[PDB]
């Protein structure tokens, strides 16, 4: 490939997947009379620790005051989890099998038989999104760009340093515009197919929070975590 310099820097921030994977597996084995949905909330929770860790030592994010950092992540935590999940399905996913953050492949058959209406609407919207990205040969350069466009959002209020946020939007957009031009020249549509996937990720993630809040009020989400604290505002 040919990777614009800014994308090379964003790539260096990607953590070692294999270590996150066994860290989350080992932790779940320790928590040990747990229910299926409760176990997955703990797996999503620890994935969110992993997301905050990545953001914390990322290029332009490390330069923000903590209050700016929180505002940005309170706005995009669920989008980052969805994007993370979606990109895991493009690379490692196969025929009828959700690839988990812990490394295993649960057959989609298992989820279909046990999932209610809300979760079916969510899992299915997620899968049509995965398949759209699968057909775009979505790669890691494009993925890390989308992550920074999601993180450095312009829909966030009360930012002390709105100038630096607007600047990384500007530069990441232009870096992605550059990468699609060099690597996929005769595929003019590519850039736009990636940007139009952002509204959809936002929507799946608002839906996911509403689902997770429904489950929390039903008493299914075991006592409080990073996920419910993000959910609380």
């Amino acid at each position: 490939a040919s990777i614009p310099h800014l994308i090379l820097e964003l790539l260096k921030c990607e953590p070692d997947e294999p270590q996150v994977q066994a860290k989350i597996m080992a932790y779940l084995q320790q928590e040990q009379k747990l229910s299926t949905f409760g176990l997955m909330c703990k797996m999503a929770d620890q994935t969110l620790f992993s997301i905050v860790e990545w953001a914390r030592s990322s290029i332009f994010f490390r330069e923000l005051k903590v209050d700016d950092q929180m505002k940005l992540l309170q706005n995009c935590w669920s989008e980052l989890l969805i994007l993370d999940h979606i990109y895991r399905q493009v690379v490692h996913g196969k025929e009828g099998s959700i690839f988990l953050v812990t490394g295993q492949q649960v057959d989609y058959s298992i989820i279909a038989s046990q999932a209610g209406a809300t979760l079916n609407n969510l899992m299915s919207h997620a899968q049509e999104l995965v398949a759209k990205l699968r057909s775009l040969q979505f790669d890691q350069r494009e993925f890390v760009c989308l992550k920074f466009l999601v993180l450095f959002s312009l829909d966030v209020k009360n930012l002390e340093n709105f100038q630096l946020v607007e600047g990384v939007q500007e530069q990441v957009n232009a870096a992605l515009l550059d990468y699609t031009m060099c690597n996929y020249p005769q595929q003019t549509e590519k850039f736009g197919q990636l940007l139009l996937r952002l509204p959809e990720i936002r929507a799946i993630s608002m839906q996911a929070e509403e689902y997770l809040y429904y489950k929390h009020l039903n008493g299914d989400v075991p006592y409080n975590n990073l996920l419910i604290e993000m959910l609380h505002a």
Binding site: F49, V52, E53, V66, Q69, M70, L73, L226, E229, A233
Partner: peptide, 11 residues
């Protein structure tokens, strides 16, 4: 507001 988020961003 978010005591846990703050903890994870400081140390």
């Amino acid at each position: 507001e978010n005591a846990l988020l703050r903890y994870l961003l400081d140390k």
